[PDB]
Amino acid sequence: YPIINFTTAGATVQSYTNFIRAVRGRLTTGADVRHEIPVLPNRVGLPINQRFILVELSNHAELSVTLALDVTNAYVVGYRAGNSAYFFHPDNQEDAEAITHLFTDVQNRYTFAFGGNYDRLEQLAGNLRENIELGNGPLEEAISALYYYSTGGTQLPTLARSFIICIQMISEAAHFQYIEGEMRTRIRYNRRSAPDPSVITLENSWGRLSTAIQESNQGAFASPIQLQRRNGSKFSVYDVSILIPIIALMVYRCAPP
Amino acid sequence: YPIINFTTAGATVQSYTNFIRAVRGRLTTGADVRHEIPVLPNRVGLPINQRFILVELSNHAELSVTLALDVTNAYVVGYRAGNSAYFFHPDNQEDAEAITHLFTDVQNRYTFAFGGNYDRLEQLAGNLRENIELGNGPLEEAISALYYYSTGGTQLPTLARSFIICIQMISEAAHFQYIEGEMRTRIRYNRRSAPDPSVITLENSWGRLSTAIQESNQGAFASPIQLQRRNGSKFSVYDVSILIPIIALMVYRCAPP
């Protein structure tokens, strides 16, 4: 599968922007764009040889980990670190067979009992997204924790906290130019801070925004979607127009009429 | 006031496109654009010295006529031909005082009793838009009829038929890239043919489309506007997006939120 490399060591806003630009280009084919937003490949009919891309991450401690992203949703399905590969609990048999193709050369393969969704991972982390720091230092630490899980050095709540960091900084940055923008600011000023309400409500709403946009009547939504602004106030979305500089990729929901 | 010159003599699709491009540029200031469509100047607060532009038309018979267009709606308010100026019945006192500034140097000034709206003009022409030809030959003839009205050579039904031609080919072409497109096809193949239902329903709906777009909730209309297609079938518009390659200029209806 293609591999995109990224290191937190000496990361700048441009090396992070290049990286997310590369991920997005690997994820989308250009064949399906609706209202100027790219749609991800439809899962039905997609060959296994085109199902995943790998993101290889290194940190200043010269430790590496390779995450496997699912091309149909850009979410992380599992990872390897040296000798071992770990996969989230497959949602169905199709995905169970698909993941057999990843990291085939690792000696030890584990599939966790829990799935990679934010509700599961927050219960396990013992903390919500609203209280977990994001930034380059958070991501630097995440890479060592994921790596040392192999050698028994990382406890499960840390493994889950570290997954929450990697998924928002790679998968959600790729899903939203807005969330990518938030991560660039953190690196510009080397700040580390939990996500405000606009970030979390966009993350929660990605599936619904994808469906409302593809089901729209010429761009007008049949019913509004409430989002939150950085200060927590509500904001109603009525039309795809205002989302065009905010969402970067939609999950496939229906054929273009 | 600015004058744009145009002659039907040897007109090509490019000399007609240049002409309508020039009119549109004279009409709009670039200061107010909503959903990528330019809005015409608001009438309240607009100085008389910026209220009108003049379009000078000549034909192969080397006869000329100068129409005065109102910048707030791009509709024709009156015209001169040699010795005389003729103005439509002013809609109110403000417009009555405004037109005193036009063609001040003509010896004879007449203001008609009827107004320049399509309902009036069709009653007077004894024919509807659906049965009046449009094209370069129609426009060539319109210019001679408007001119000879001065010398008593043009009867009133012909004067009205000729006004219906000039307003759709200048004012409506400027209002709609779609109607401009229809006129370019007529000149490309030197066809002369009455307007199909899409042209007439756009002409009738220009005011409502302007208000629905400016009153929209992020581009979504609160209630749909039915238009007709060339073959007469109905078509519902729900969103400004689909109108963006169709309408070129909107009349001012409200301040941008």
UniProtKB/Swiss-Prot annotation, chains A, B:
The active site is at residues 75, 118, 172, 175. A deglycosylated form may be linked to monoclonal antibodies to produce immunotoxins exploited in cancer treatment. However, a point mutation should be introduced to eliminate vascular leak syndrome, a side effect resulting from endothelial damage. Changing residue 43 to A: No effect on the toxic activity but suppresses the vascular leak syndrome. A carbohydrate binds at residues 3-5, 10, 45, 136-141, 190-192. AMP binds at residues 75-76, 116-118. It catalyses: Endohydrolysis of the N-glycosidic bond at one specific adenosine on the 28S rRNA. Glycans are attached at residues 5, 231. Changing residue 71 to A/M: No effect on the toxic activity or the vascular leak syndrome. Acts as a glycosidase that removes a specific adenine residue from an exposed loop of the 28S rRNA (A4324 in mammals), leading to rRNA breakage. As this loop is involved in elongation factor binding, modified ribosomes are catalytically inactive and unable to support protein synthesis. Can inactivate a few thousand ribosomes per minute, faster than the cell can make new ones. Therefore a single molecule can kill an animal cell. This is Ricin A chain. It comes from Ricinus communis (Castor bean). The chain holds residues 41 to 297 of 576 of the full protein.
